[PDB]
Structure 1
Amino acid sequence: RNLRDLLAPWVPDAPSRALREMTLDSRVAAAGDLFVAVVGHQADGRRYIPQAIAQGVAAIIAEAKDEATDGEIREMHGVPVIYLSQLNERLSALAGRFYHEPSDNLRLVGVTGTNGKTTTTQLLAQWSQLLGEISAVMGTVGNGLLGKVIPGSAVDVQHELAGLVDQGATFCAMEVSSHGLVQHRVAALKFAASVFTNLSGDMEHYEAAKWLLYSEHHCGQAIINADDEVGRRWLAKLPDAVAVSMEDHINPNCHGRWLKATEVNYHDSGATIRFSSSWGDGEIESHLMGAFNVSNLLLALATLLALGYPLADLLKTAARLQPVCGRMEVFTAPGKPTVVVDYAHTPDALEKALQAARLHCAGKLWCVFGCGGDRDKGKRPLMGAIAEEFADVAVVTDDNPRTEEPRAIINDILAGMLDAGHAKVMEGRAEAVTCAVMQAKENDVVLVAGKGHEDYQIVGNQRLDYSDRVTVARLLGVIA
C-alpha cells in the first residue's frame, strides 16, 4: 500500500509513501495511516488535518472544495496533503484501489428494495454455498461468512469486503440501502448481479434521480420482481434484466429472460413451488413460510441461474435452504400442530406474520403474543385488534414485562379488541405457549410472535433463560 500507486489513476506526481490503514476519523488515524478529510453535513474533516499530522499519519487526501485545485499536492510538516474535487463521489473508488478491489475477487450480489433484502441475501449466500462457494453476507443483521455474522462509509464497505476476501469468501450477498446508494457508499463496487425486491410528478423526479444513480453503477445482471409496479417500469426499460413473477406478470412478447411460479401449495411445513423459466421448469420444496418468502426464493433462484449456476444443482440443494432464525420459522412434528416462531413485535409485522401463517393453515390459526413493559403503550390495543381479526384464537401472555405490572400490559392489549372475552389470557409465557401447542389440532397453526431468535424473558431487572424456539421444540419432541 503506497500513496503514489493508490493515486496513480488520478494524480500522476503523488509522492511515494508506505500506508497502513485508511480512515475518515482523525481520532483513530495512527502512525503510517492515510487520513481522508471529507466535507459532509456540518462536518469538515480538513479542520482535523493538524491533529492527524501530529498523530503521525503518512499522508492525507482532502476535499479540494474552496481550498485547492483537483490533484493539488501540498506538504505540511513533511506530510503529503493531496486535494481531490468531489471526494465523497470518489471515496468508494479510492478505498477499492486501497483494498485491492475486493468486489473483483469475489462474486458480489447487491439486493435493494423496501422489504425482503435480509431474506433474499441470506438465501443467495446459503444457496451459493450449497453449490460449493464460501459465502458471506453484508447487511442489517451484520457482516461475515455464513454462520459467523458480526453485528458506515464507502471506506468501511470496501474494508469489510476486503476482510471477507481475506477470510476466503468467493461469494457475498450485500443488502444495499437506498440511503447507502445515494451517499455513493457502493459507487465503485463491481456487482455481479443487482436484485430488486419491491418499493413501498413526484414519481418522475424520484425515478430520474434513481435511474441516473444506477446508470453510474456496475449493476451486472439485473434481477427484478415483476409483481412490483416499480419493478415492471424498470423491466420495461431493461431488455437484458430477468423478470421474476409469482402473480402472472411475465409478458412473453418481450422474449426476455424470465422465471415465474405457476402454482404454489402452502402446506404445514413449507411451500411446494412449481415454476417455469427460460432456463427450464422445476418444483422446489421450500421450508420457508408465506408468499413473500416464495418471492424472495424465486429472486435468489433467478439471480443464481443468471450468474450461470446450473438449474439441476440449484433444484438438488433447494430443500436445504433455511429460514432466517426466528423469521416465520416453522417447527413441525408427527401429529402435532404446525408452530411458527416469528419476531413480529409491531401491529404491521404481526398482521403480515398472521396473513403468511394463514396460507399454511387448514384448521385454526392461534396467535400467542404479548407486549414489552416500560415501553410505548400505543401498540398494545393495535396488536390486540390485529390478533382478534387475523387469528382464530388470541392467546395473550407476557413478553419482557420488565418492571411493569404484567397484567396491566395484558389489559391494554385486551382493550383494543371488540370481544376481549374471546381472547385466552395465560401468564407464564412458557405456560401460554404450552396451552396453545397442547390444545391446537393437528392441522392448526400456532404463531408464537414477539421474540423470534431472542433467548431471554426480562421480568423485573432479571434477564431470565427463556427461548420460544426451545419451548416449542421441546413441546413438539424436536431439537431447536
Structure 2
Amino acid sequence: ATPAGSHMRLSELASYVSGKLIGEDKEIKVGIFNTLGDANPNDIVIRHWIDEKGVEIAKNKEVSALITQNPKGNSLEYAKKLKVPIILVNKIELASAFAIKWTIKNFAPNTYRVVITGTNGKSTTTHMIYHILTHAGKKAFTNTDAKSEFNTLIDPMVAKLLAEKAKKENLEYLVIEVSEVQGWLDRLMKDHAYLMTKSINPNVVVVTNVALDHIGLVNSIEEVFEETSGAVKALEKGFAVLNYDNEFTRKMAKLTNKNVKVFFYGKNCPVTFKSGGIYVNNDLFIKKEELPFKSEYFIQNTLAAISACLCLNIPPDIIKKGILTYKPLKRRFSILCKKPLIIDDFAHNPDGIKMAIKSAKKLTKNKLWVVCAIRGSRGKIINKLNAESLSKTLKNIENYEVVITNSDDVVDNLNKVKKEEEKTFLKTLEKYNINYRFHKKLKTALEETLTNCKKDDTILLIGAQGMDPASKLLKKIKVIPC
C-alpha cells in the first residue's frame, strides 16, 4: 500500500519501510523525502546512519521523521527526549524505494516512465532520452546530469530531486537511470536493480549491455546478467528495449512477462546502424557526418535512445532534432584537439577499452598512441582483464604505441595504483608481446607522448579517475586549446 495525501501515522510509515518506530506514535504532516542538510519542516529524512548531532539538527529543522539503519551513540534516547521520531530499518534501500513510489504517486502519477540500466552506456542513454524529450518541450525528470548520477537506493536522492521538480512542473516523463550492479562498501547489494525498477513501475526498460566490471562485487559475467536482468523481470507492462548485439541482453527477452513487448535494436533490427548511418525501418535516419568523430558506444547508445523514444511514440522527426542537438557527458570519447587528434575517453573495463581503441583506430590516419592509466585500488583482476582487452584489441593493429601510467601525481588515496596492480597490468602486456613505455606520473606520460607524436597521429587517452585530470594537465603544458 502507498498512501495519497500529506499526512501519515508514524507507525504506518514504519510499516511501509519495514522499520520499527522509536518514540510515541502520532499523525504527522509530510513534506517530501529529503536529506538532513536540505530538510524543510515536515520532511522525512532517510540517512543510513545518524548521530546525536543529526538528531538535534532534525529537531531544529522540524523534520517529521528520521529513517535510519544505524543510530550511533545515544541517538535513540536523545531523539525520544527531543520527540524526534526515529524509524529503525535493517535495509535502507526499502525506505528509499518506498520514497520513490510515494513521491511518484503523490507528485507525478500521470507520467510515462523509462528505466535505463546496463554496465556501459546507461548514463549516456538516459541523458540522450532526457534531452530528446526536453528539447521537444516536454516536461521531464531525470536523475543523471553532467555532474551527478543518483542511480541507487542507498539514499533518498531520487525521491528528493523528483519531488523538488514535480512541485514546480507538471511532469510528463520520468527518465531514470538504475544501477545494475551496486555495492554497499565491498558487498554486492543483491536485487538492487529489481527493487529500484519496481519502485518506478516503468513503461519501458532499456538495457544497454552486460559486461564485466565491478570485480569483487561480482566475479562472472553470468552474475552481471542475473543482477541486470532484475530490471527486466520488474517490468510488468510496456516494452523491453534490448541490445540485440550483446548476447546477455539478448538472453533477457526470454525473461519478459506476458504483456511486455520486446524491442530489439542492433544488427538486422528495425533500429540499426549500417553503411555509416543509422536506419529506422530501412530509412536512412542519421547520416555519417551528422555523427562526426563518434564512438561505437555513442552509436549504440543512440540506437537505444531512438528505440526507447519510439516505444514512447515520439515522432521520428522530433527524435532526430534531439539527437542532432545532443551534448555528451564528460570524457565520453571527447575530442580535445584535431592536430594531433586527441581523444579523451573514460574507458575502464574490458568492453569499454576495446570499444575506445577500435573507434579511435577508425579515425586514425598514421600512428595511434594509446595512453592508459591503471585503475588504482580496484584490484588485480580488473586491471589484468583490462590489460588483456587492450592487448588483444591492439595486436592486429598496425603502427601503434602504448604508454601506461600510474598517475601517481594526480590521483587521491582511494585511487592509488597498488604494486600488485601495476605488476599484473604490465605483466599481461608482456604476456601478449605488447611493447610499452611506463611512467609513474600522468604528466610525464602526456609530455613525452605529445613531444614524440606527429600532427597526423591520434592520441587516445583512456582511464577512469587516473585519466580524469588529463585535460587540465593538457592545458597546463599548453597543448590545449590547440
Give the TM-score range, shorter chain.
Answer: 0.5 to 0.7
AA partner of residue 396 (structure 1): V
Q: Which moves more between the two structures, 291-300 or 435-444?
A: 435-444
Cα offset, 1:372, TM superposition: 7.6
Please report how far the alpha carbon of residue 224 of structure 1 lies from its aligned counterpart in structure 2 after TM superposition: 1.8
C-alpha distance in 1 between matches for 2:363 and 2:422: 28
SS of residue in 2 equivalent to 1:104: coil
Partners of 1:304 and 1:428 in 2: how far apart?
A: 44
Cα distance, 1:303 vs. partner? 0.9
Mapped partners of 1:112, 1:345: distance in 2? 17
Number of residue-to-residue matches in the alignment: 413
Correspondence 1:264-413 to 2 at 5 A: 264-265=275-276, 273-277=277-281, 281-284=284-287, 285-287=290-292, 289-331=294-336, 333=338, 336-344=339-347, 350-371=353-374, 390-391=393-394, 392-396=399-403, 398-402=405-409
Aligned-partner Cα distance in 1 for 2:279–2:275 = 9
Alpha carbons 1:102, 1:162 under 8 Å: kept = yes
* Superposed displacement of residue 331, structure 1: 3.7
Q: In the superposition, relative to structure 1, how do residues 206 and 317 fare at CA in structure 2: closer, same or farther (>3 Å)?
A: closer
Cα distance change, pair 289–277 in 1 and its aligned pair in 2 (3 A): same
Q: 2:65 aligns with which of 5, 24, 35?
A: 35
Paired with 2:374 and 2:227, the residues of 1 have a C-alpha distance of 41
Q: How far is the alpha carbon of 1:432 from its aligned partner? A: 4.7
Mapping 1:126-141, distance limit 5 Å: 126-133=131-138, 137-138=142-143
Equivalent of residue 198 in structure 1, options 187, 190, 209: 209
The aligned residue for residue 260 of structure 1 is 272
- Offset of 1:311 from its aligned partner? 0.9
Measured after TM superposition, the shift of residue 155 of structure 1 is: 4.6
Instruction: State the AA in 2 paired with 1:277.
Output: N
CA contact (8 A) 1:246 1:260 kept: yes
Give the whole-Å Cα distance in 1 for the aligned partners of 2:434 and 2:240: 52
Question: Does the alignment pair 1:55 with 2:82?
Answer: yes
| Secondary structure at the counterpart of residue 23 of structure 1 | strand
Report the aligned-residue RMSD. 5.3
Q: CA 1:470–1:50 in structure 2 vs 1: closer, same or farther (change >3 Å)?
A: same
| 8 Å CA contact retained: 1:366, 1:444 | yes
Report the counterpart of residue 160 of structure 1 in structure 2: 161
Instruction: Tell me the amino acid that sits aligned with residue 65 of structure 2.
Output: F
Greater RCO, 1 or 2 (C-alpha within 8 Å, sep 6+)? 2
Deviation at residue 380 of structure 1 after TM alignment: 7.7
Q: Give a deviation string over 1:205-263, Cα, whole Å, max 9, x none.
A: 99999889756556644322222334344445567535233322x3xxxxxxx4222x1
Q: What percent identity do the matched residue pairs reach? A: 18
User: Aligned match of 1:417 in 430, 437, 445?
Assistant: 430
Query: Relative to structure 2, which stretch is displaced further, 388-397 or 116-125?
Result: 388-397
* Cα separation, partners in 2 of 1:98 and 1:328, compared to 1, 3 Å: closer
Paired position in structure 1 for 2:148:
149
CA shift, 1:49, in A, is: 6.4
Instruction: Give 1:300 shift.
Output: 0.7
Tell me how far apart the structure 2 counterparts of residues 374 and 98 of structure 1 sit (CA, whole Å). 38
Q: CA deviation at 1:318?
A: 2.0
**Structure 1: unaligned runs, 5 residues or longer:** 66-85, 251-257, 266-272, 458-465
Q: CA deviation at 1:327?
A: 2.5
CA distance in 2, matches of 1:433, 1:204: 38
| Counterpart residue identity of residue 260, structure 1 | T
SS in 2 for 1:3: strand
The answer as to whether partners of 2:354 and 2:393 remain within 8 angstroms in 1 is yes
Once the two structures are superposed, residues 48-95 of structure 1 have per-residue CA deviations (whole angstroms, 9 ceiling, x without a partner) of 7655432323x67678x9xxxxxxxxxxxxxxxxxxxx9986873466
Of 296-305 and 378-387, the range deviating more from structure 2 = 378-387
Change (3 A) 1:50 1:264: farther
Q: Which amino acid aligns with 2:401?
A: A
Matches within 5 A, 1:447-462: 447-450=460-463, 456=469
> Is the Cα–Cα contact under 8 Å of residues 244 and 260 in structure 1 kept in the other structure?
no
Deviation at 1:275?
A: 0.9
TM-aligned CA deviation for residue 366 of structure 1: 1.5
Distance 1:317 1:471, change over 3 A: farther
CA contact (8 A) 2:108 2:170 kept: no
Shift of 1:195: 0.7
> 1: distance between equivalents of 2:326 and 2:242?
21
Change (3 A) 1:98 1:388: closer
Task: Give the aligned partner of residue 23 of structure 1.
Answer: 45
* Matched-pair contact (CA < 8 Å) for 1:395–1:424: yes
Is the CA contact 2:331–2:344 (under 8 Å) kept in the aligned structure 1? yes
| TM-score normalised by L of structure 2 | 0.65
CA contact (8 A) 1:36 1:60 kept: yes
Question: Contact 2:117–2:177 at 8 Å: present in 1 too?
Answer: yes
Residues 423 and 214 of structure 1: CA distance in aligned 2, closer, same or farther (over 3 Å): closer
Segment drifting more, 373-382 vs 149-158: 373-382
The structural deviation recorded for 1:181 is 3.8
Shift of 1:176: 1.2
> Could you say which residue in structure 1 is the equivalent of 2:249?
231
CA deviations 1:263-296 (Å, max 9, x no partner) are 153xxxxxxx231239x64124234633233211
Cα separation, partners in 2 of 1:114 and 1:412, compared to 1, 3 Å: closer
